[PDB]
C-alpha cells in the first residue's frame, strides 16, 4: 500500500502511459488512492477488492 | 505566456509526454516560465529565445 502511493506517481513521471500497457496491483486497497477518470487515456487497469 | 502555462500543465496532466510527440511553443519566454527538464523524459520540446 505504501509503495502504491509512489508507483502511482512515477507511472506518471516517466511519460510512458500508453494504452498498450496492462497494470495490476496486488493490494486490496484501491478506493483509498487517487483515481481520476480522465488522467488515463484508456489504459487497462485492474485490481482486487474485498 | 499564460495560455502556454495552462496548456502545458494540462498536456502534462493527462500525459502526452512520450516520444510519439514533438511539441513547439512560439512563446519567447520558456526559461522565465516554470520549466524543468527532469520531468522531460519522453517527449521532445523546442522553442524560441530572443
Automatic annotation (TrEMBL), chains A, B:
Q: Where in the cell is it found?
A: Postsynaptic cell membrane
Q: From which domain of life does this come?
A: Eukaryota
Instruction: State the similarity comment.
Output: Belongs to the glutamate-gated ion channel (TC 1.A.10.1) family.
Describe the function of this protein.
Receptor for glutamate that functions as a ligand-gated ion channel in the central nervous system and plays an important role in excitatory synaptic transmission. L-glutamate acts as an excitatory neurotransmitter at many synapses in the central nervous system.
What's the protein here called? Answer: Glutamate receptor
Q: Which residues of the full protein are shown?
A: 233 to 282 of 871
